[PDB]
Symmetry: D2
Subunit: 234 residues, 4 copies
């Protein structure tokens, strides 16, 4: 039993409230730069992740209760050539000792190991023919790169996106939405996810992003703010 909440209107560099993995770094301007950028231009074969320093308990094996949580964040994906973008950004939950995985289409969160249990909401900017639908899309993933559900997403180059994710334990319902406040455009996806049968009791959480493996298929993956709140009933 327990709870956890926080709010970061921007990110302060060199402060242990985040666990940086791969190429992820925090700029002097307070931006969480998940993937490498060289003189404004994003580089290929990049992978970066950022987890909150502390994990939270998503379910209790003694009481059998499951936590409900919500998280919101703003991010920007900018690309020199809007026709060739890759690979995407994601919010995910995984074991406390989670480490970055495969590059590119794997979004750094997938590589079946029963110890690599993961739930994620993906903002996929490149469709992989072997497991992805057509065009860019939002997706909800459980233990593999192939989403259990997807919906079309009209990505807007360099535009600020506001994301909201919520999980209602009582109905095992995970909802994810993305809005471009400046454009008044919005997208949403929902799926049943039984976290109790997927993830361990305690999990770390945060962001993961990668750029394309092939030249030209690059993009930035910057998070600008982040708030979180969970509650595990006693």
């Amino acid at each position: 039993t327990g709870s956890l909440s926080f709010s970061f209107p921007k990110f302060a560099p060199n402060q242990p409230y985040l666990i940086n993995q791969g190429d992820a770094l925090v700029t002097s301007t307070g931006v969480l730069q998940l993937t490498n950028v060289v003189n404004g231009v994003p580089s290929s074969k990049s992978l970066g992740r950022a987890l909150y320093a502390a994990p939270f308990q998503i379910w209790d094996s003694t009481t059998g209760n499951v936590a409900s949580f919500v998280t919101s964040f703003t991010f920007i994906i900018q690309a020199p050539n809007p026709a060739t973008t890759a690979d995407g950004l994601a919010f995910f939950l995984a074991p406390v000792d989670t480490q970055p995985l495969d590059l590119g289409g794997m979004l750094g969160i997938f590589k079946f190991n029963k110890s690599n249990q993961i739930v994620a909401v993906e903002f996929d900017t490149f469709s992989n023919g072997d497991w992805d639908p057509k065009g860019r899309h939002l997706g909800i993933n459980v233990n593999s790169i192939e989403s259990i559900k997807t919906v079309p997403w009209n990505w807007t180059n360099g535009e600020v996106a506001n994301v909201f994710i919520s999980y209602e334990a009582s109905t095992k319902s995970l909802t994810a939405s993305l809005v471009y406040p400046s454009l008044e455009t919005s997208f949403i996806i929902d799926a049943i996810v039984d976290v109790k049968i997927v993830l361990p009791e305690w999990v770390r959480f945060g962001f993961s992003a990668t750029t394309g493996i092939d030249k030209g298929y690059v993009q930035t993956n910057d998070v600008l703010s982040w708030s979180f709140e969970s509650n595990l009933p006693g």
Copy 2:
């Protein structure tokens, strides 16, 4: 400056935390029944509203600050004949002394009086040819029955819907989403709404719903739970 938050997993009847208007009532089972139902069958020409007992400050004239808030609720709209439904349910904000207005298509929140300023998210089950798009839809309204923006909505007879509404003062962005957790279907709408130039400093808020004026065009409008949270920066 200030804040307000609450959570009602269900509604308790005969308790002054809600201000009931029109035909609205709370059943012994804890359901907020906005419109009249006779032996299971909803009646026509019904109008009911429910406001939280206390208002909250949505903006401060001294500091110029604007509040950000979120609210979520679950509701059910059941109809004997799914082909003829009317009129809809809405979440709205208005002056503290707000009273029910016109029936039917007006959703009990519209009737231009500068004192009847109102912002609302509507779940419209009947398209009025004079100001509504085709088919059922979600809508964001500011001072009139004609929404500033709408999106198609596939209403599911008697299914439990989860709604989430959020307002980010910094971007004047109002987002509204509806999900049917059991069906994994979802809808969303977003629009710019400058509450500071629309509503007074303090406002009351809650639900309003009406049934059709013509025989046959009836439906229930039941809210099952409600949580709210606002914050006006100092």
Copy 3:
């Protein structure tokens, strides 16, 4: 089951978030003036109360659960003659339809009617020989003017006091503390209070204060800010 929280750094006049009773009023400066003041001088035989507009559920008869809550507020008690002060200020919980009771020593919250169940923390500025200890004191009262426990209080004329009250359902422990931030002085009291066996499921709450009945025994009773938070486990 449910929750309620709010924060008022100051009070806005003419806004229905408070239910004013007796002589209570909100000044243009945002001060909650519980008892009458004439040209700076407090008058005798005054009684004023202020309740939050909405009640909250303090315990659930179906689940048997009891809520835990905390509240904090700042207040000032100023008197022309610091040697003759009366009668006091209190924070209390009572049935939703609670109305002001007796003046003076009764603090407007006591008058045995099983329907007038009340729990209160009193900041008593005058010792009534028939039921009060010696000198000014903090007190915890349950159903009567005679406190179940008291502790000495060194009241400081016109000084700003910060009060904190907390109730832990699991241990039925009610704690009340008063601090004069400017003077670094502090006082505290604690007592077991079984709210489940004392109060009804839903209760309204707030402040009550009275001035002395005899000439000269007067004082102001002004609250400057107020925050509250309760949680009833499901």
Copy 4:
């Protein structure tokens, strides 16, 4: 700018939400055992600390704002010989890289290094003649083992104590209180502490405790639960 809150009704062992230092450990029963215990009997020369995994921002150098926070926890101090107890338990704030310091009377948080800035509330069970008052006492410390203020404390062997600490930035007021819910006894202390001029922008926080250096002067220092909440205005 930002915020952080959490609640742990008990502690789960082997989970990275806490940073354990010195002899501190979490028992299978969920108790945070700060100092060594051998077969029920606490050992001497022990020192243990526990910090939340993530730090929080206590003040912003760009806006100049200072955070307000509150924390509560329950703890037990049990001793074989209630006549000889040492040394104490404390809640403290310090730089993110804080490491345990001196044993015994230094409570593991003191050793003047401008980089070892620290603010702490101490529950001192042994009076050190060179800097402590008479008998056990609560204390508020800023940069040294000599408290800026103390108050007598009647420690009760093995009894469960509830502690509440609050800091109001606007008045730079730090309040600390201890209550024995079962006994209805209570103690409190308050002092002005300008965290902005004492601590760095970001700080880690938690508990520290030590046992006596001389044989016989031992005691357990167990924390049973912990909740925290801070808010740094934008």
